[model samples]
Target: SKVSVAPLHLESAKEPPLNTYKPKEPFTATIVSVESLVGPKAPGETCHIVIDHGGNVPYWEGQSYGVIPPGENPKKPGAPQNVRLYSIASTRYGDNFDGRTGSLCVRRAVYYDPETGKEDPSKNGVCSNFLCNSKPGDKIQLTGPSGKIMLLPEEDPNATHIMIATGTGVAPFRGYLRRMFMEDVPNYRFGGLAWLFLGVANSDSLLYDEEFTSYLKQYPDNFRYDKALSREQKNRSGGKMYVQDKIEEYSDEIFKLLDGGAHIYFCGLKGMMPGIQDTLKKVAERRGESWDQKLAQLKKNKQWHVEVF
Candidate 1:
């Protein structure tokens, strides 16, 4: 039997705070911890860094915090490095279930020169390196609780969420899942499905596997998790399996969910969209529908959300 729920109207929900701290005058947050997010054999290092905000810089789940690396830009002499934004990986209540901390998922960016068989120090990502190398009690400059594009519809506890992410793009979805499955908020209780599709290079690169698997075991009916390990799986065409291919495999149910007012979110590399759109277009064509029209309708209804970098 299909479950039904009455729509909620939460007029009293607090508004999401925006840029309370700007780049010019950023808030200083102390690092609480920096934990490795991947196995030892994973392709690269990904850190789940927690920062103490002291309950002063309140931010919503989907918002991003801008980090200003504490060093002068090489080309610009005395000028400070520009702020780099990272999605919040923890709920507003934070990892400690207290309002004093927030977290970020950062993959250390190091350029490997294949020809030289050495690392390119000059090509290292400034903010990401600074963040990954940070130690406990280190003060870091932070700005914004910025961006509303990826915010969840807190008023709709029964609304289905179709979340697709790749690599560190799983940051915001971690926040969402923690809020939905882990926390016991006074006014919110999720009664709908949250199906997440995560893509990564291999099994070792999968992020938050333990926590997500625990949720899967605890809430079998309400939570779903899928993974696309490109190096370890294959597609229908005998090529490497990717997130789009996984989506295509479940096209029927996905389309049905979309028709039923489900909100679909995409967060990953911008390069992922082309393959996803192509697969969707092909699936829609097979079903005797127009992909463009469907996309337009989804956009009109504000059911499609994307945050690709």
Candidate 2:
């Protein structure tokens, strides 16, 4: 029941303010460290990296930044190097809860055929490979801290948030998790339920288990963490359990939560969306609720948001 991990490269909108930091205005952040965040023998490589911006690049949760590959831009000659955008995994205050550094959860971009045990060097991800192989003290060209489309519903502290994420898609949620349970920001104190439905290939791939588990213990009433270990878990039909299976298994609670005005969020690979939508539709039908209308209303009220790549 192994699913292909999502692509590390992301596509961004070309709308106004097309980018956060144009080539003319870029930041130079030195790599602090790049370490495996997943367990040994996990499906592939995923690293938790930190960079010292020296208080230069300030950002918020749910925002992203771009990393310029070490080599020249293959697309545009004599132009800025190619950049891959990465969501900030730490709070605006950073991992140290200070303004001097930031963190990212990056999965090495490699292509392999599970059936053939073959590798494709041609598909190597430029930024990801460079970052993954990088060492401490290496100065890297940085751009952005882009995006404002995704943010926690800070408008209502009493509002409930239902987060569904898989693999490295959990990056942004890391920021939300820290702010809610770990830090005490001005004008913001977590006062509502924060539910997480995480999907990983196996036990080893579960990220931030230690910190999230601590939050569960520290704020039992405010935080709930659920995991779908695809390779190890099964559904009632004996199919390999995926995130959708968990949603189906707990549809009753999910339906009721939305009924009470919960904000639902989806992050991770785009492929997971279709299955999740189907599950939601089925869940709604069982309760005689119109999935379409419910979804429409959710969007109208800004109660639904997605940041998938």
Candidate 3:
């Protein structure tokens, strides 16, 4: 070991602050709260858990960040590092209220075989396992309010916001909904429609189940919400159902929303993307048009954004 002496004249100085960010600010957070979800823990399912951000944590809807264990060094040098992405599930407000309205929905990562579709519970994932076993008063690290592909601008007076999510994938959209309903920000003229579609293996695995139902019952005229119970609800053709299959069933309305310039924000697992795209293609076929062409137009026009795990 080598040692060196410091200059006595050196003095401490404040860090120069970053405009959009600050140097001293933490890229992590402490777990201030925890709760076990009672119903289905599967995708298209809802879980109720609240976490206290150690300090005032600022964020926007549709943004995402990483959760890392403090000072954790993996055994293998190049083995895949355990970093899990979670969409923000809370309102931008302080943690004073557990109103059951605003919260993060995190899906526990299953170490399942991509080829065989079998889960290996023996291997643990970084983020999900940590949160699952954590308690209140524990500290967890986090990264920024970073994401561009989120819900459309809240101030877009002529545009509506359409959100679709599955399982814990509802995390980001929860932030958007709170931004629209809880705060005084513009919502009505943001667009003429607010639609959400969620698909799950069973009704039990769904999150915010009560809230979605209540929204529909309370404001059936302004908002539209639908859920497809894939494992349980049989399709029209007597097949196991899923969101992609249902998207085809409702292409007329989906296309109408697209033509009207409403933004479609999809959050959930990436596996759902191909099917969703394929179903839209079918819609385009039936209408004597190219779904891919329309989809390309949507992407170019910033009318579609996807956030998936």
Candidate 4:
């Protein structure tokens, strides 16, 4: 009798460093820089903020840092605002290519009052506003390198990574891309595909366009990027373009890659999941397969990774 051998796939060797700094006892990192990530015409402001950690709180590509806003909570007078977690937008080496700093992608949250038709200062996102408006030399409280859900598989340097994101959800993917294309890590050299699907309102809202396009130019074979401009583009049904539509356009290729043990990551808003799942389900049904079963299998294989907010 012949024995069937299981196929080899890579696993994450680095254990995620979670809660290195807690909310009660947070690390104070200085703001190194804060720059807008969107164009002048972009609907909302998104800032790429870097902070000098001095190598104190080290984190991997896909983890997040919790920021405690400076102001006290209105509801709980005298108590500080609850910690807000933002995904790290740079690699372990940081934005300046140094190991002593880290970065965050923050989208300023402003509320436009429906009744008054004006900006509501009271409804703003505390941490987001604080991070976005932060100046150099400003002190910011931070806690936890937080999650383990989105870490890249270091064990498999040649693993295919399909990253799907929207808006600031592009944070972690930025880190991954930097590691794959920008850094000179001794232990890891990516030998497989890293395809990204980024969805936004328009061309103006696209994040990391320059960096990503530059990577495409330098490493065309390894990096593939696609965009869904909702306000500027349309899907097959004449509807606004979205991440799911783009994924559906390449359903065959994506499904094939997934079957071949590729890791697919979904980040951004929790709202994007339903559309993506529906599209995949339709595609799976067309192929006479069960979407539920396929999803379950992928989860069992640790290939379906998601980090949504």
lDDT of 2: 0.80
lDDT of 1 by residue, 13-107 (tens): 47888999998899999999998899877899999999998877878889999999988878789888888999999888788877778999999
Model 4 earns a TM-score of 0.94
Model 3 residue 146 distance off true place after TM-score fit, in angstroms: 1.4
Candidate 3 Cα outliers beyond 4 Å, as residue runs: 1-28, 38-49, 54-56, 75-83, 94-102, 112-122, 186-191
Report how far off residue 176 is in candidate 3 (Å).
Answer: 1.4
Compose the digit string of candidate 4's lDDT tens values, residues 44-152: 9999999998878888789999999887878899888798999999888787766778999999998887889698777888789889999999999989989989988
Q: What clash pairs does model 3 have?
A: 28-142, 44-167, 44-206, 45-205, 45-206, 45-207, 46-206, 46-207, 89-103, 159-190
Q: Give stretches of model 2 more than 4 Å off.
A: 1-20, 113-115
Better of 2 and 3 by TM-score: 2
Candidate 1 to native Cα RMSD, angstroms:
4.3
Cα lDDT for residue 131, candidate 3: 70
1-309 per-residue lDDT for model 2 (tens digits): 111211111112223133545656677789888898888868888899898987666676788888887666667777767678888888766776556788989888888787997888767787887888889999888787788766777878878988898888888899888877776554567789998889989999888889888878888999998899999899767877889889887788877888798998888888879878987898889889899999999888888889888
Runs in model 4 with CA error above 4 Å?
1-14
In order, what lDDT does every prediction score? 0.89, 0.80, 0.61, 0.88
Instruction: List candidate 1 segments past 4 Å from native.
Output: 1-13
Give the TM-score comparing model 1 with the true structure, all chains together.
Answer: 0.94
- Evaluate residue 295 in candidate 4 and report its C-alpha lDDT on the 0 to 100 scale: 96
Measured with C-alpha atoms, the lDDT of residue 4 in candidate 1 is: 23
Q: Model 3, 1-309: lDDT tens per residue?
A: 111212211112122112222223444455556665436434422334455544334444565555655433477554434445566676544224332222456556567677997777556565676776677667665545456677346546556777777666777766665445433342223335677788877866776667667666655665687788888887767877878777767788888888988888888888878877877887799899998789899999988888876
lDDT of 4: 0.88
